[PDB]
Amino acid sequence: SGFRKMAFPSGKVEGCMVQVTCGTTTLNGLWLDDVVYCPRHVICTSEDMLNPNYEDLLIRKSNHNFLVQAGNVQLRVIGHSMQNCVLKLKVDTANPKTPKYKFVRIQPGQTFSVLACYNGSPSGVYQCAMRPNFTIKGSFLNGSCGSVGFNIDYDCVSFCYMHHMELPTGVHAGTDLEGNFYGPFVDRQTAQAAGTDTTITVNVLAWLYAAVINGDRWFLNRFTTTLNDFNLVAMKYNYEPLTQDHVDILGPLSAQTGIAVLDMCASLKELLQNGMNGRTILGSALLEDEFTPFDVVRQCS
């Protein structure tokens, strides 16, 4: 029993983190086989931030301008190239700790573990969701760029996020490991801001199932709703539409608890319209939307 924000064990990723320094800028890199990946903004200077031409900036670099350190060991850079918004630094040593891995772009609403790193040294690990607006509500300080997000399946690390920036509201934005930004954000100085966000309905339902499995039943009722009627309420409260595929995805949790998905939707409707009346669900006085159905199945009986 119990239900926590639970990250994947980070050891396989820890062995891949390195420090990358160019000029006076230091950030983190990801060392897999004989390549180190890092944000291309490592080559920026504050004196050219409006519209940096990264192709020009990189042409003016040499391998020796990049200082790469794995712990106390310096890795010799033997090639450099740009892929979208990431830099690929070829090094003369393959990382002996390279896990089995994939580069996999995630969908808004999915979750992943973040290994926050500073100076190539891992500092902490926590669970995040990709918001509908393509930001993440992370916890990152100066020097955190190049930290990565990932999921682990069996022995295989699926890298999905590399950290690039903190937006004015304190939320975070980054790229997949092919260097393509999540959402409409750019690695140049602008007034860019997080767009309007919504609540991840399928995840809230998953979390209500987690609560039932953990003995919280006070929000249950005898009523059911239709998908159409529920989605009218979802719209009013800035929740994402619920699809039949979401309903299907929630099947296993519905079967384990014996509560039909549309039955649980009727509970969610009442919670949106009435609040909780001073009660809590899984230790929260709000509706939590950062656990996917998969996350719930992973922790629940």
Ligand SMILES: O=C(NCc1cccs1)[C@@H]1CN(C(=O)c2cc(=O)[nH]c(=O)[nH]2)CCN1c1ccc(Cl)c(Cl)c1
């Ligand atoms: O978001 C930034 N600056 C605003 C922007 C300027 C242009 C685009 S965004 C980050 C902030 N930053 C951190 O180390 C840091 C990270 C964090 O999460 N929290 C935190 O307090 N600090 C230094 C690098 N810096 C940056 C510099 C150049 C570029 Cl091009 C980019 Cl993308 C990022």
